[PDB]
Design a binder for this molecule. Structure first.
Ligand SMILES: Nc1ncnc2c1ncn2[C@@H]1O[C@H](COP(=O)(O)OP(=O)(O)OP(O)(O)=S)[C@@H](O)[C@H]1O
Ligand SMILES: [Mg+2]
Length: 408
């Protein structure tokens, strides 16, 4: 007597019951559409129907349990929540409600929630929200990150360390090795810290890039495709960040690997304007600045760390304005050099103009002391002839032995 055995299933596989049930024809029905016909059939013979989703309260006071699998897309398989059920348990957008659901009545489109079991993976008896969580520093906890796959991660913990609940900005021009850098972060965080909920968000991304990201990354991978309207690029980011805070409310750590603040801001721009400077509404930047600005280490407990990408040298006059607005709004900067990518040289990062401010407190009292040694002999070093020196003086060693036996 259940139907939550597996909801997150592939399309061709989901037709398991489509080859077992007494269904007429299922030729032109979507994946989210076919679950609706199956759920109603398991309702025809009484039974109990369990279910879960992510809360999104609409303009009219009611909400729906949006499927995290479908990147919070609106579908028929969504579970409805009444305004009465919102007041009953103090529910806000971003909540992960789970429990028994009910079949629709006559004149009802959606399936509705019946019983509430877990809110935010916890009993309905819980407190303080992210908006009033005291935010002192990013340095009390650290996300430390001999294969060549650990070469696009080794430089990071020397060039620009990643703090727990830290605002990070990756700056990259087209074709600089940006997409796989995020895939290298995702590895050096899952294969190192499998406790903090990892969310990988991609705005206005290609269909082949999202599926590859969905494959290689362990965790929540929410993304919007290029064919989708400008409004949907917002909805996903609006839903990912609203769930993230809700988890930080439970003293839990959350890391968001957002792709392109620009591509997110370009969406936030085409969805409400008024007076322009170079094709960008100056008022529109307020909404995406709230997204990136939420990244913090909470004093009471938990963290929210957003390591997002900024696009420079796109060619567009709009994209040049966006990065300028975000220059130093974060406290962690990782530049990606154009010239190092032009001559096939990877872990391509501008070590020189890529620091990670407020460092002192993120490392031990002398963990930084042997890091400023190389940092003092980079000024006379070139650009493309600076990264080759960072491989040979690293490959023959490990992490802490990088200078103890490498000082002549
Ligand atoms: N860590 C890495 N190790 C080895 N090769 C890399 C690494 N990062 C990037 N590359 C190479 O650099 C190229 C960059 O392609 P992507 O991984 O898609 O990065 P990208 O700069 O985001 O590409 P665009 O601009 O979105 S088409 C690839 O062809 C890879 O071969
Ligand atoms: Mg890419």
């Amino acid at each position: 007597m259940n139907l939550t055995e597996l909801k997150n299933t592939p399309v061709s596989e989901l037709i398991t019951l489509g080859e077992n049930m007494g269904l007429e024809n299922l030729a032109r029905m979507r994946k989210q559409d076919i679950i609706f016909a199956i759920l109603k059939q398991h309702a025809k013979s009484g039974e109990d129907i369990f279910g879960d989703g992510v809360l999104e309260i609409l303009q009219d006071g009611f909400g729906f349990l949006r499927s995290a699998d479908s990147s919070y897309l609106a579908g028929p398989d969504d579970i409805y929540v009444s305004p009465s059920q919102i007041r009953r348990f103090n529910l806000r957008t971003g909540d992960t409600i789970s429990g028994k659901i009910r079949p629709p009545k006559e004149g009802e489109r959606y399936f509705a929630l019946l019983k509430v079991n877990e809110v935010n993976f916890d009993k309905p008896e819980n407190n303080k929200i992210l908006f009033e969580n005291l935010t002192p520093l990013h340095a009390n906890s650290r996300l430390r990150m001999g294969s060549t796959e650990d070469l696009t991660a080794r430089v990071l913990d020397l060039a620009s360390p990643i703090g727990r609940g830290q605002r990070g900005l990756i700056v990259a021009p087209p074709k600089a090795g940006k997409t796989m850098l995020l895939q290298n972060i995702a590895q050096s965080i899952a294969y190192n810290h499998p406790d903090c909920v990892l969310m990988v968000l991609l705005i206005d991304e290609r269909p082949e890039e999202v599926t590859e990201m969905q494959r290689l990354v362990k965790g929540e991978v929410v993304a919007s495709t290029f064919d989708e309207p400008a409004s949907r690029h917002v909805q996903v980011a609006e839903m990912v960040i609203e769930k993230a805070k809700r988890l930080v409310e439970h003293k839990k750590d959350v890391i968001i690997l957002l792709d392109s603040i620009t591509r997110l801001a370009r969406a936030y721009n085409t969805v409400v304007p008024a007076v322009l400077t170079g094709g960008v509404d100056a008022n529109a930047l307020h909404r995406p600045k709230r997204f990136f600005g939420a990244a913090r280490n909470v004093e009471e407990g938990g963290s929210l760390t957003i390591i997002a990408t900024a696009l420079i040298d796109t060619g567009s006059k709009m994209d040049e304005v966006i990065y300028e607005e975000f220059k130093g709004t974060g406290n962690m900067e990782l530049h990606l050099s154009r010239k190092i990518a032009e001559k096939r040289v990877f872990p391509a990062i501008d070590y020189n103009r890529s620091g990670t401010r407020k460092e002192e407190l993120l490392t031990t009292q002398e963990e930084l002391q042997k890091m400023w040694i190389l940092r003092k002999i980079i000024h006379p070093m070139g650009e493309i002839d600076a990264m080759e020196f960072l491989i040979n003086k690293l490959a023959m060693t490990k992490t802490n032995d990088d200078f103890f036996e490498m000082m002549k």
